[PDB]
Write a protein that binds this ligand. Structure first.
Ligand SMILES: [Zn+2]
Ligand SMILES: [Zn+2]
Length: 307
């Protein structure tokens, strides 16, 4: 109970699969090997690829960027500052401190600077979270496309997958349920999106961040009581009662995911930015009322202006 399975050092955490108590260093190894297997299993990345990590200042993206760097991947990071007064400044400061420790270049996009408004400052009854998700997802893909990155890696973990799944099944969001899993392959101007933490729990992510010295922000905004926090608690209660519930729900989902494909509405190029649009002008451009394209091509980072 008190000691590590592979050494005489004090146990740091208890790992359920396989059953084992691991010290700080054997946990780090376990974790990294788990991420490494997820990459190979779903053929997520190759070491020749230039990977962009979307870093929010939260633990999930911090850990994603940290483990990919440790594994030997070619990674660069992107932080999207949402311009939320009293939130966005510390979020950026957190993301900078993380990328300095990781030793990865950090690119910053300030929404307030390019668009004029922060998330929650736009005159709309539309909840800040919906248009924020739209904004982040667009900036991530366009920054990556504009700078010739081959793949985007996000920090979503098993708990995020299972919670997103439960919410969407409860609202029967079958379109969202067709576009799921650890990899959204590269299609047109959509850059390949990957989730290397897909098979690791939020608990394991928290323990990794603390053991390697990563400091992160819990809340990215003051606009997040949403369903996901309720779903995670639900799934945790079901997981402590029936161990293997979360894994099975996601494993089962990946096998049946096919059934939701006919629900997909059959994707042209935007007339403003030339990015994937369902209509004449894409949702991002239509929302922000843009008549001009945003060029995310960078010659260098702010912390390394001469490289
Ligand atoms: Zn040990
Ligand atoms: Zn557009």
């Amino acid at each position: 109970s008190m000691k590590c399975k592979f050494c005489s050092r004090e146990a740091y955490i208890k790992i359920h699969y396989p059953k084992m108590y691991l010290c700080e260093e054997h946990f780090k190894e376990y974790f990294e090997r788990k991420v490494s297997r997820t990459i190979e299993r779903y053929k997520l990345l190759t070491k020749d690829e230039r990977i962009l990590v979307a870093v929010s200042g939260g633990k999930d993206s911090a850990v994603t960027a940290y483990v990919l760097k440790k594994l030997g991947y070619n990674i660069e990071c992107l932080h999207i500052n949402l311009g939320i007064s009293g939130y966005s400044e510390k979020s950026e400061e957190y993301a900078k401190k993380q990328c300095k420790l990781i030793g990865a270049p950090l690119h910053i996009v300030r929404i307030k600077e390019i668009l004029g408004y922060g998330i929650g400052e736009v005159k709309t009854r539309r909840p800040p979270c919906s248009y924020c998700g739209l904004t982040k997802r667009y900036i991530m893909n366009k920054f990556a496309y504009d700078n010739g990155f081959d793949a985007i890696a996000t920090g979503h973990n098993l708990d995020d997958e299972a919670s997103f799944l439960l919410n969407n099944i409860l609202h029967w969001n079958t379109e969202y349920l067709a576009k799921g899993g650890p990899i959204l392959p590269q299609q047109g101007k959509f850059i390949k999106k990957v989730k290397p933490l897909y098979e690791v729990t939020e608990r394991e992510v928290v323990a990794y961040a603390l053991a390697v010295g990563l400091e992160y922000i819990v809340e990215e905004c003051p606009y997040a009581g949403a369903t996901t926090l309720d779903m995670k608690g639900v799934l945790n209660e079901l997981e402590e009662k029936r161990p293997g519930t979360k894994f099975n729900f996601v494993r089962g989902y990946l096998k049946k995911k096919k059934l939701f494909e006919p629900e997909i509405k059959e994707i042209k190029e935007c007339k403003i930015c030339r990015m994937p649009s369902s209509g004449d002008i894409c949702a991002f451009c239509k929302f922000w009322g843009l008549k001009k394209e945003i060029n995310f091509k960078v010659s260098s980072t702010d912390e390394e202006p001469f490289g």
